[PDB]
Design a protein around this ligand. Structure first.
Ligand SMILES: CCCC[C@@H](CN[C@@H](CCCC)C(=O)N[C@@H](CCC(N)=O)C(=O)N[C@@H](CCCNC(N)=[NH2+])C(N)=O)NC(=O)[C@@H](NC(=O)[C@@H](NC(C)=O)[C@@H](C)O)[C@@H](C)CC
Length: 203
């Protein structure tokens, strides 16, 4: 299908014979599911995101049906806030990111979807993250007024400064909206700005 980003891109998946809800997440390298039992052996791993790391169980070669499309690959199981389908499985089902509903660039998900943005008169690299509600940019001395906010990622919450009505040009496409500034490991463009540029998931 084609999926717009005004709402979280939640879909039903089937895994181990059970149905679950999960977020299609272009900003995730891997697929991470809440605690459950899976057939087969697993091994311990750590994965990270905002706020640091969690311990997970890695299962390899697990069949997963994602909105009716078949994948077989690695599933990490542990205390993730949200079930997420990451690039390891999105690539198996042929998912791409498309600007302006496919009139604009197509971004495949073989590697992290990093693009150039312009914000506050600076050029920066940022990850297009369909699993992010909001846009989070690394500490940057923006002039002007802000309000405090906390935002939560795989390893916890971080404190950020919320700035409103900030222009952000994304690969040449002009957007304007709320930007959160704080200590993220990667600059993140979230749905609040992806929607303004007509970005869709397609598979
Ligand atoms: C779990 C919560 C939902 C998914 C998550 C995906 N964000 C990416 C951002 C990239 C890192 C800052 C992420 O955590 N990615 C991980 C997912 C875990 C995974 N293993 O795939 C990742 O790829 N981690 C890499 C590390 C990044 C560097 N890797 C690399 N360069 N190859 C990894 N392998 O450990 N979204 C978020 O973290 C966002 N959270 C949200 O959108 C919502 N919050 C919550 C708690 O649901 C909203 C209510 O605030 C943050 C950014 C605030 C807007």
């Amino acid at each position: 299908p084609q999926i717009t980003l005004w709402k979280r891109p939640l879909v039903t998946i089937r895994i181990g014979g059970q149905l679950k809800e999960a977020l299609l997440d272009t900003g995730a390298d891997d697929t991470v599911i809440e605690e459950l039992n899976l057939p087969g052996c697993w091994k311990p791993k750590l994965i990270g995101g905002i706020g640091g790391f969690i311990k997970v169980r890695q299962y390899d070669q697990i069949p997963v049906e994602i909105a009716g499309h078949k994948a077989i690959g690695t599933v990490l199981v542990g205390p993730t806030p949200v079930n997420i389908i990451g690039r390891n499985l999105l690539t198996q089902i042929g998912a791409t990111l498309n600007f302006c509903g496919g009139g604009g660039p197509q971004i495949t998900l073989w590697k992290r979807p990093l693009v150039t943005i312009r914000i506050g008169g600076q050029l920066k690299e940022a990850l297009l993250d369909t699993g992010a509600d909001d846009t989070v940019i690394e500490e940057l001395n923006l002039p002007g007024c802000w309000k405090p906010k906390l935002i939560g990622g795989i390893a916890g919450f971080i404190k950020v400064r919320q700035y409103d009505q900030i222009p952000v040009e994304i690969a040449g496409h002009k957007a304007i909206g709320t930007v959160l500034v704080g200590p993220t490991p990667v600059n993140i463009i979230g749905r609040n700005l992806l929607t303004q540029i007509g970005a869709t998931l397609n598979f």
